[PDB]
């Protein structure tokens, strides 16, 4: 799937009061059970990157954000291979789980999807 799809659908849910009332608590528990925070990841670190779009979004990250991401992946890989979890400051707190990459990938995809649309335009 496209990140655009995920983001749009999520916005439909957050708009509807009914839907948000039932879905937002579920999603919070889901993320607690998911347990990526226990390896010191931010959600966005888990998005599949071996796609041309995502490679481009990663190249557009500010240098600091990019260096931090590389550290989080290396740290997590080391916890993975050790079968240890993050402790203390390594655990991602809910307030630190920021969508640092979503803006960049949404821009890359916006252009790619406009390009597809415009490749199919018919002069009326």
């Amino acid at each position: 799937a496209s990140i655009t799809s995920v983001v749009k659908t999520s916005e439909l849910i957050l708009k509807s009061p009914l839907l948000s009332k039932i879905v937002v608590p579920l999603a919070k528990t889901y993320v607690k059970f998911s347990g990526y925070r226990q390896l010191g990841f931010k959600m966005n670190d888990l998005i599949i990157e071996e796609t041309p779009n995502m490679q481009l979004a990663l190249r557009r990250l500010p240098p600091t954000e990019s260096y931090d991401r590389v550290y989080r992946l290396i740290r997590a890989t080391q916890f993975s291979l050790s079968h240890k979890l993050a402790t203390g400051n390594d655990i991602t707190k809910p307030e630190e789980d920021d969508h640092y990459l979503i803006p960049y990938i949404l821009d890359v995809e916006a252009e790619a999807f406009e390009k597809d649309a415009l490749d199919n335009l018919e002069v009326v």
């Binding site: 990663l58 240098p63 990019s66 260096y67 590389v70 550290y71 290396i74």
Partner: protein, 85 residues
């Protein structure tokens, strides 16, 4: 998507220092007792439901099915077998 040593395709790394010691300088089995007990317990507890739920359900299903099948091919189960065919 993967390169080779020297151009693996990592975003540029900076600011991480990695440290390690020689295999000859380390105790390879340091804290193995603690890990074998406490670490395995932690990791198993965290994954237990994902094994127990499907296994317990499918075992119950099979148990019910095998017991019904056995009962249908008894004398007592003659009539219920006749209807089932």
């Amino acid at each position: 998507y993967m390169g080779w040593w020297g151009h693996m395709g990592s975003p540029p790394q900076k600011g991480i220092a990695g440290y390690t010691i020689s295999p000859f300088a380390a105790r390879p089995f340091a804290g193995v007792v603690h890990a074998a007990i406490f670490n395995t317990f932690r990791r198993t507890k965290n994954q237990a439901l994902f094994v127990i739920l499907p296994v317990s359900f499918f075992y119950y299903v099979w148990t019910q099915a095998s017991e019904k099948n056995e009962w249908l091919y008894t004398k007592a189960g003659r009539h219920e077998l006749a209807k089932a065919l």
